[PDB]
A paper describes a structure:
The intracellular c-di-GMP level is controlled by a dynamic balance of synthesis by diguanylate cyclases (DGCs, containing a GGDEF domain) and degradation by specific phosphodiesterases (PDEs, containing EAL or HD-GYP domains). In P. aeruginosa, the SiaA/B/C/D signaling network regulates biofilm and aggregate formation in response to environmental stimuli. Recently, we elucidated that the DGC activity of SiaD is modulated by its binding partner via direct interaction, whereas phosphorylation of SiaC by the kinase SiaB prevents the SiaC-SiaD interaction and activation of SiaD. Dynamic switching between the inactive pentamer and active dimer is regulated by SiaC: SiaC induces deoligomerization of the inactive SiaD pentamer and binds to the two conserved motifs in the stalk domain of the reconstructed active SiaD dimer to stabilize its conformation for further catalysis.
To investigate the regulation of SiaD by SiaC, we determined the crystal structure of full-length SiaD in complex with SiaC. In the asymmetric crystallographic unit, two SiaD and four SiaC molecules bind together, adopting a unique extensive conformation: two SiaD molecules (SiaD-A and SiaD-B) form a parallel coiled-coil via their stalk helices, and their dimeric stalks are stabilized by the binding of two pairs of SiaC molecules (SiaC-C/D, SiaC-E/F), each at distinct locations (proximal or distal to the SiaD DGC domain) along the dimeric stalk. In this complex, each the SiaD monomer consists of an N-terminal domain, a C-terminal DGC domain, and a long extended coiled-coil-like helical stalk domain linking the N- and C-terminal domains. The stalk and DGC domains of SiaD monomers bind each other in parallel, with a central C2 axis of symmetry, to form a dimer that covers one-third of the SiaD protein surface (4460 Å2 of 15,159 Å2). Two DGC domains in the complex are oriented anti-parallel, with their active sites facing each other. Moreover, a non-hydrolyzable GTP analog GpCpp molecule was observed to bind in the active site of SiaD-A. However, there was only one GpCpp molecule observed in one of the SiaD A-sites, leaving the other A-site empty. In addition, the side chain of the key residue T68ʹ in the N-terminal portion of the SiaC α2ʹ helix inserts into a space between the parallel SiaD stalk helices, forming strong hydrogen bonds with the side chains of SiaD residues S82 and Q86. Triple mutagenesis of N67ʹ, T68ʹ, and S69ʹ to alanine or phosphorylation of T68ʹ significantly prevents the binding of SiaC to SiaD.
Author numbering:
A (entry chain D): 1 to 125
B (entry chain C): 2 to 125
C (entry chain E): 5 to 125
D (entry chain F): 3 to 124
E (entry chain A): 1 to 264
F (entry chain B): 1 to 260
Amino acid sequence: MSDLHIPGTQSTPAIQGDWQAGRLSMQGDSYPENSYELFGQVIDWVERFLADGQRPLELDLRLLYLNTSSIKAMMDILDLLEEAHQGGRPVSLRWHYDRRNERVAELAEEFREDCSFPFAIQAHD
Amino acid sequence: SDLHIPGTQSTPAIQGDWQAGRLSMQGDSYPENSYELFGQVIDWVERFLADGQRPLELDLRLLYLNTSSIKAMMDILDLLEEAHQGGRPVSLRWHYDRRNERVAELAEEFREDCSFPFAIQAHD
Amino acid sequence: HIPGTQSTPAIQGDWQAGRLSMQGDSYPENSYELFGQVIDWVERFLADGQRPLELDLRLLYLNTSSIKAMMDILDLLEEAHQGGRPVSLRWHYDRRNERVAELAEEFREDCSFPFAIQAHD
Amino acid sequence: DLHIPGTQSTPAIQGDWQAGRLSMQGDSYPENSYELFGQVIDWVERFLADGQRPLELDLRLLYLNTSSIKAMMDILDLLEEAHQGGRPVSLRWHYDRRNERVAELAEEFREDCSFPFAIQAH
Amino acid sequence: MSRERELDAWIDGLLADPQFHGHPLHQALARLRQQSLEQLVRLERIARISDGFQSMAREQNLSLSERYHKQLRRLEKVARISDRYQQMMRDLNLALKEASIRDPLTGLPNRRMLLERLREENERSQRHGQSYVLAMLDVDFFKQVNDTWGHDSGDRVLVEIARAMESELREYDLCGRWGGEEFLLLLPQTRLQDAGPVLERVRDSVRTLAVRVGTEALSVTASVGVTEHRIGETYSQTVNRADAALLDAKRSGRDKCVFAALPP
Amino acid sequence: MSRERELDAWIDGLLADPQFHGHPLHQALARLRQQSLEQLVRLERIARISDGFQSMAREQNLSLSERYHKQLRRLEKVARISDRYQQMMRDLNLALKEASIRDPLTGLPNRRMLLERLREENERSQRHGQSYVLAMLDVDFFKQVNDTWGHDSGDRVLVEIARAMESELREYDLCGRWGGEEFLLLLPQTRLQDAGPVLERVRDSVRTLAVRVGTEALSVTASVGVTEHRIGETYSQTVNRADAALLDAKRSGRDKCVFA
Ligand SMILES: Nc1nc2c(ncn2[C@@H]2O[C@H](COP(=O)(O)CP(=O)(O)OP(=O)(O)O)[C@@H](O)[C@H]2O)c(=O)[nH]1
Ligand SMILES: [Mg+2]
């Protein structure tokens, strides 16, 4: 069990994994030069959380631009969530976006396509 | 049996010259449907490598490449590497403007797994 | 007409055309149940009246039992050919897969009737 | 003593004269099944004919092609021959628990064996 | 198969027939028929086991194939999503560039563009020695256009002037909006002697324009001052000399085009 | 087997007894022996073909395994290369973004962009230790230009002053519109002695402007105050010193440049 706090930069997102809340939050643009160094600890945190009990896990995303391996990492995380959901664990995801950029919402729809857990695409209002 | 794809604003210009034995591509590559664009290129390359043994040369003047385009280029390169490992003479020349610094190291990544002649060339 | 599944081959016995055609993987669970008709169809045709019989095969994998049934059918074709009956077989295969072709030449070693092992792209 | 080292495609086999045990390990896709398993059958025959001391077989076999299954049935036949003649012989078959199907295949090997035939998870 | 059954049946009849019971070969045949049944069972068993092993291996291989296919998909999906992110980024960059370098009303290049290009052509002049010419054009009596027909009419007039000038320019020449009713022509890698004809065609283009505003068809003239870039001089001093030539055009009566040269 | 051996031998000895030849039980014994040999031959062949089939399958599975792991690495390589292309697209994006916070009238960086650079140069004044030169520049008697000629005109003078000052700067120098007729010039990693020439050139370029209004040509001049960043102070303090210098240049007439 651990709290994860990765400070954002201008090229990499801020990430906060709150173990008591059961919440993984991410904010910002994601152009990491070393994608594994950013996201490996995150995927590991999600795995540890899922293995340590059956409390729910909610992802709270305020992500902007994602480069290719960020996209790949987000799908890896979705895969873990889809497996936990198939097995009875309550998991869920909120994807916030500025309403004035509605292409973003279609991008999120693409991430949601193969997810069967609650996956809410939400404008800031 | 040539291949001619005219180069639009968002898709590259591609000429497969059959008896010259040369595949040439120029421009940005942001294709909306990457299959439609590169499937005929991959089929043309496959036809040429199967039809006999004349040598194949890629001559490229490419600019920005989105992700599906990078993938298709690697597919093409895999075809060339396979033909090279079976004795077929194949070669590639990657042309870039010297001003772009980073283009070269992109190309070098493209070439890391390539046993055949892969030339990266600054051209002003 | 036997519809193929993912583990069974698709089989078609054209009475008028005089053709037995077979396609796909053969891992049947109950090999007799599937191949006994085919053998019954084959011998019913051979006894019915001197029309030529052609086998059009593009099988992929054959398990042990399936190999045994294929040799039974080939035995029928051979005894027919020994009595003057015109019988032929052609085995197509993907060229990238040489291994099947020998295997087909293995099936052919005891056949004196037309046995053509044919490639395709 | 019989000792044949295992390959990528053939099993390691140890026929220990003193403890009186034949052991086999690995996959079995032999190119020349005769050349491989003839030595094994001959060793088993010579041991069974030499003098009433017991034979147990300790098999860690994985995949077996068709001629290998034939060779195994030959060997089991010789073991049941010895067993109905009062010779103490037996076998255990070791298999990975997570592979369901190796157990059922081993049982089918056991079905006409009257000597101790123990199939073993690990 | 037909024959093994036919034979076992014939043997059955033989073994049943009372005339054979007691013969030295009867009992032998019974024993051997039994032995053959056992050998047949052994053969079928062999096959069945073998079939079982191949089913196991197959199941494993189909599992691996399914993974492979998933991977393929994953790759195609990752690439697609990424492609779309990059298309959005591309559209954003295009709009921003458009806003920074193109003039909203006329579509022409703007001051920033011009200046930027003027810097890089001065550099080119330096190294390769190829100069450019500069023509600065100012609409005569535009204020009458605006006062008689409104500023929307003058705007249409400026659009038409832009279209006309761009139509008589070579493909690498640059016609920019320089001011409210001023335009800057940059002819790169061009000398005055070669500029003369192009410039005169540009001025014919503007002169013969007739912009319809309702019931009237407006015509205009432009003054223009033109210079050549003198090497060893900043692009701003070039612009200044073109501008002073424009001033002389304007003072000398309009619909005029004055060149500036250099007394040694 | 061994009982089967003994039975086959007994049977063969029976079959060799000519007294049974032709007997139906003799025929059936012979047919069963022959069928036994034939089944053994058939088995040898079946097993050989089947062995070959599963050898093929074994190699096909090993090939699919290799393909699967090469697929994993290919996805990682595609993503790596793509990320680098997108890094170039991002550098472009940030350039344009910063290039759109420009003074709408003159196209120069605005006050905000001036403050942002000022803070960035204050920090580099620490870590590398070379300070910057700051000049505050003001159009003389601009109010007269606006009163005489109009605001439109004044505005144009400012657009052309921006053109002229920008033309005389070196590569890393920065020219911004502080506000009104006031501009700020920033020369990073420079010190006053190197500054003088460039600042003379910038005043020249303002001086020799000849801005048309209709058929007349305007001449304008600029006063300018100059100083140096004294590290650790705030940009603000530095500005203030440049501003006091400029006020001194205006006190001593027009078209002047005092250092502080
Ligand atoms: N319709 C438009 N009018 C403009 C635009 N920009 C400026 N103008 C008007 O241009 C008018 C041009 O005035 P200038 O002194 O040239 C006056 P005039 O045309 O009479 O020029 P000269 O003949 O050259 O003396 C001026 O009143 C501007 O306000 C514009 O974008 N659209
Ligand atoms: Mg005018």
